[PDB]
Amino acid sequence: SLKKGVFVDDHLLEKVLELNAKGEKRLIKTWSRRSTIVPEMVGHTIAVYNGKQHVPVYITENMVGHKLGEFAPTRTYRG
Amino acid sequence: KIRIKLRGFDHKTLDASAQKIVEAARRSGAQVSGPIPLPTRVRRFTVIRGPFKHKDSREHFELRTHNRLVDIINPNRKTIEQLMTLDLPTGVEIEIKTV
Amino acid sequence: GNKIHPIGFRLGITRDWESRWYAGKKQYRHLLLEDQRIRGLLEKELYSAGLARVDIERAADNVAVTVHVAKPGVVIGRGGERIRVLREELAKLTGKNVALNVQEVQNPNLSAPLVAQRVAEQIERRFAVRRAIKQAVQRVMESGAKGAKVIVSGRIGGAEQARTEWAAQGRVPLHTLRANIDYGFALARTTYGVLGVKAYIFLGEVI
Amino acid sequence: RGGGKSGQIDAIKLGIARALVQYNPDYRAKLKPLGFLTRDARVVERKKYGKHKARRAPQYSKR
Amino acid sequence: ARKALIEKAKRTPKFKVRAYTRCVRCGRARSVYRFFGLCRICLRELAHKGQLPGVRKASW
RNA sequence: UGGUUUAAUUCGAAGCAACGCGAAGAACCUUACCAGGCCUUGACAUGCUAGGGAACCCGGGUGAAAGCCUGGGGUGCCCCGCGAGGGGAGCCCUAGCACAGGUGCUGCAUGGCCGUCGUCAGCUCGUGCCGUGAGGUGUUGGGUUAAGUCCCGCAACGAGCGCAACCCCCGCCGUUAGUUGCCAGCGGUUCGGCCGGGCACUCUAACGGGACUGCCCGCGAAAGCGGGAGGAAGGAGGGGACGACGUCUGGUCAGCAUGGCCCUUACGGCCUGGGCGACACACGUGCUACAAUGCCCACUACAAAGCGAUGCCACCCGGCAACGGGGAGCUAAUCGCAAAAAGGUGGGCCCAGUUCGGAUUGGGGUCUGCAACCCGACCCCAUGAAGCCGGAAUCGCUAGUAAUCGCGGAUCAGCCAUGC
RNA sequence: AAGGAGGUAAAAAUGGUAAAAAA
């Protein structure tokens, strides 16, 4: 992916800074499952946008520098 | 010291030009470097038969453009004069370059 | 049941392009585009009196609006006026330097495009196919070819089953190279569908 | 120069067989039944479209 | 669809990686020879019609 | 591709002739499938009414963009006036409106394109004869050929589209041409055809010549036949493009057209993501392999073709590499891709799942592009699996053909290219 | 070895597929 820098929405930065400016209520409703789970996202509920619903994931650490929607399966039925 | 390049579409009027032009230069001047045959520029195209999904069975096609060269030694008034305007290549353009 | 384009077959020395100018790799595309739009605009809004050749000579800005038409008079204008607006429509849509041409062939039944054009015209106005078309083949053979194959496909009077109709007379060797065959295709369009009109006129050897 | 090494070798056979047939046209009349005059008739045929190696046809199925 | 597709290529979008070829004399994006700006069948028809310049019925 | 599954898994082609097939460049583009947000006199076009603002540059809010409310400046030109005044068009808008739109269905509505039998060797006309006539005839009869190609017979003698043939690619020679070439001729040489000069030789590209069983020996009632000669080229010299009359109610309105049919603030548009990459099998076509004609490391040479100006990039430097920084030259037979590989010369490996094989996978970088999770490619360390030559049965191949090995291109930011 | 004809021995695992119709 990226090499000199790292991709994440700028709106994710700017909206981290706000819900950090209050330590406010839960839910981040990203309408783009792209944007890396870059360090400063702590571990809050991510209702990432699938195409169907809003997959809500409680982030940990074992996932930091690796994409958000990289955690939503979307493709139903496995084997 | 005059280096003229022939850029054309068909060898026919291409050499037909080259004949009179070189002679008219030999006419109103002196020695003229004969119409050298620069390797004819040809392009490659490969389409198929019909629109409907067939991959194999086809028809190939190719672009035909022709390149040549003419030089002289003296910038005579009369050569310049004639070999300037006196032209009708219709569908052929050329390049004047110096050396 | 094919027939590789007899005109695309003629490409040797038996049919010169309908566009001879210099195109240098780059500008060549836009040249082809602009020019094709000229052609296309002509073909309809210049129809009136039927043309074959859509030839154009160009180079640097210079344009040659060259046409082979089956009539010049009632397509040049009552005072050389039809040439005016049209030529300047070209010039307006192709801002450079336009130069009209209305060369005329003294024979209609010679030259397949327009022959087929009339052939399609008759059926377009709902005429009995086989009769009139076969006798049109006979018209062309009252003019003087060595062969004329004017086939006509599509819906024949409707009846769903759109076949193809056999009309011809005299030998036609479109396989042969030095045969010099003008071939012309006319689009037949009935209010009940689309029919095809192919004319094949064979001229002569030693040319 | 040009083409290929071994091909150059064969081309050397031809160049020789053409070099001596020049300065002694008597070797000529006796050299023909050996073939040292013929050039070639075996050049790489064009990649035929529809097949892999210019004649090598791709595999059949049907079933 | 089809009409808006031409406008999409006509207007030319924001980012570079959004453009796509278009046979202007038929209207198609895939396999459009970006030398003539024409598709495969567009190209074929225009050549056979005794219209395509430079090129010839290749028989090498 | 089949399936199954999936919110959705865009559609089509179905023995042979569908299965690396349209598709020769699916990250969102493409895009026609799902969901949601939105738009709707519409993404486009042609036009009437009421009124307005000229056009038009620009800003915020706002969100995923699509989109939505709203905000500053603004006032060219035309009919009469050194003042005021009204209206016209370029123009964008709001309401009715004529209207557009569909990658919605029908190839059993179609042109066109094409696939096919299949390079099949056929198809057929004039005139004469045969029969009451349909019609037979030729063309039914025998050798031979790639051939309805050629000879013989014969109620027929021909002729046409095909066959061939002329057009081209390709080997020998001819005329012209000289920033590719060239000491072949000579002068010099940091000894490079680099510095002068020639066009013979390479060559490059247009007009040509050359081969016809033409000739020599024999055979055959002829066609034809064996052998031989001159020849670069022997009896069809090699490959192409050429594909009849016509069968298939073949396929495709989802490239394109066009009959009908249906919908019409939605079966139309945008945007955004997800998806067409799913996995329990099956199958088609393909790649590299399982290896000592072998693989690994070192060293030196012969390609044709195509591509290349916001492209090709030489070059130097940077990094283990990926690739990046500085930086010459070219719209090119004159600058570059470019490193051909096979060969060959030198050493290893020493019959082991082996230094054979690169599949799985993690660990980190770069490059692409807004952005690479599902979804790119490239590189560096490591894991180094399966696999020790493949039964029922089947692919192709008659001469520069099998196989082996490399190269360029189309589309392309990139690349899923083992494709063409 | 020619035809033409007269009496003797040969050779198909299976196949269902409709229909108002179009000239």
Swiss-Prot record, chain A:
Lineage, broadest ranks: Bacteria, Thermotogati, Deinococcota, Deinococci, Thermales
Role summary: Protein S19 forms a complex with S13 that binds strongly to the 16S ribosomal RNA.
UniProt protein name: Small ribosomal subunit protein uS19
Shown residues in whole-protein numbering: 4 to 82 of 93
SS bond partners: none
The organism of origin for this protein: Thermus thermophilus (strain ATCC BAA-163 / DSM 7039 / HB27)
GO biological process, alphabetically ordered: ribosomal small subunit assembly; translation
GO molecular function: rRNA binding; structural constituent of ribosome
Annotated family: Belongs to the universal ribosomal protein uS19 family.
Record keywords, A-Z: Ribonucleoprotein, Ribosomal protein, RNA-binding, rRNA-binding
Gene name linked to the record: rpsS
Keyword Transmembrane helix: no
Superkingdom in the source lineage: Bacteria
A GO cellular-component term linked to this record: small ribosomal subunit
UniProtKB/Swiss-Prot annotation, chain B:
GO cellular component terms, semicolon-separated: ribonucleoprotein complex; ribosome
Ribosomal protein keyword on record: yes
GO-annotated biological processes: translation
Pfam family, one: Ribosomal_S10
Keywords in alphabetical order: Ribonucleoprotein, Ribosomal protein
GO MF terms held by the record: structural constituent of ribosome; tRNA binding
HAMAP family: Ribosomal_uS10
Oligomeric and partner information: Part of the 30S ribosomal subunit.
Family: Belongs to the universal ribosomal protein uS10 family.
Role: Involved in the binding of tRNA to the ribosomes.
Name listed for the protein in its UniProt record: Small ribosomal subunit protein uS10
Species assigned in the record: Thermus thermophilus (strain ATCC BAA-163 / DSM 7039 / HB27)
Source lineage: Bacteria, Thermotogati, Deinococcota, Deinococci, Thermales
From Swiss-Prot, chain C:
GO cellular component: cytosolic small ribosomal subunit
Name of the protein: Small ribosomal subunit protein uS3
UniProt keyword list: Ribonucleoprotein, Ribosomal protein, RNA-binding, rRNA-binding
Coiled coil: none
Higher taxonomy: Bacteria, Thermotogati, Deinococcota, Deinococci, Thermales
Protein encoded by which gene: rpsC
Family per similarity comment: Belongs to the universal ribosomal protein uS3 family.
Xref: CDD domains: KH-II_30S_S3 (cd02412)
Described purpose of this protein according to its UniProt entry: Binds the lower part of the 30S subunit head. Binds mRNA in the 70S ribosome, positioning it for translation.
Disulfide bonds: none
UniProt keyword annotation of RNA-binding present: yes
Gene Ontology BP annotations: translation
Assembly description: Part of the 30S ribosomal subunit. Forms a tight complex with proteins S10 and S14.
Domain KH type-2: 39-107
Example of a GO MF term: rRNA binding
UniProtKB/Swiss-Prot annotation, chain D:
Biological process (GO), any one: translation
Superkingdom classification of source: Bacteria
Keywords: Ribonucleoprotein, Ribosomal protein, RNA-binding, rRNA-binding, tRNA-binding
GO molecular function: rRNA binding; structural constituent of ribosome; tRNA binding
Disulfide bond entries: none
GO CC, alphabetical: cytosolic small ribosomal subunit
Parts forming coiled coils: none
Function: Part of the top of the head of the 30S subunit. The C-terminal region penetrates the head emerging in the P-site where it contacts tRNA.
Description of how the protein assembles with itself and partners: Part of the 30S ribosomal subunit. Contacts proteins S7 and S10.
Similarity comment text for this entry: Belongs to the universal ribosomal protein uS9 family.
Name assigned to this protein: Small ribosomal subunit protein uS9
Organism encoding this protein: Thermus thermophilus (strain ATCC BAA-163 / DSM 7039 / HB27)
